[PDB]
Amino acid sequence: GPHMADLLLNSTQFVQAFTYLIQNDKEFANKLHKAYLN
Amino acid sequence: GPHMADLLLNSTQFVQAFTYLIQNDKEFANKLHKAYLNGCSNL
Amino acid sequence: DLLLNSTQFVQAFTYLIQNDKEFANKLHKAYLNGCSNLLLD
Structure with missing residues (x-):
């Protein structure tokens, strides 16, 4: 259960x-930083 | 159930x-955040 | 850094x-795998 x-x-x-x-x-951190920008 | x-x-x-x-x-956010930092410094 | x-x-x-x-699905697979362990024991 x-x-x-x-x-x-x-x-x-x-x-x-x-x-x-x-x-x-x-790759996670790059993907993450690149995503703060955008 | x-x-x-x-x-x-x-x-x-x-x-x-x-x-x-x-x-x-x-709690949830901070745990994910710390995994991020660790990842950074480790990799 | x-x-x-x-x-x-x-x-x-x-x-x-x-x-x-790509990333969301990666997390989603993580999640499914966790689910599998739990549900199918």
Whole structure:
């Protein structure tokens, strides 16, 4: 039984999934800076 | 409870929910921010 | 290195996820994968 609350984007598992993604995606920061400009 | 699988967000709903959460949830935003910094300095 | 602050980052991220479809989908796949683990155990 995963809970209804466990599937919210801000739950542990997802934050973990996202931060891992962001922290490790080499291009992410460029994509991010280039996007402050625009 | 209900059938959890039915909570599954499509890519458009996903972008809506994320935007909302990153804009109104300080904890959420800061964790993503720190992942950004770390990424920067690590890479 | 620019190094945005958390105010600047939210704005940039919000913009990114709304406009760069490649990146949004990447996050969305991350999310689906998390969902899969949870739901299909």
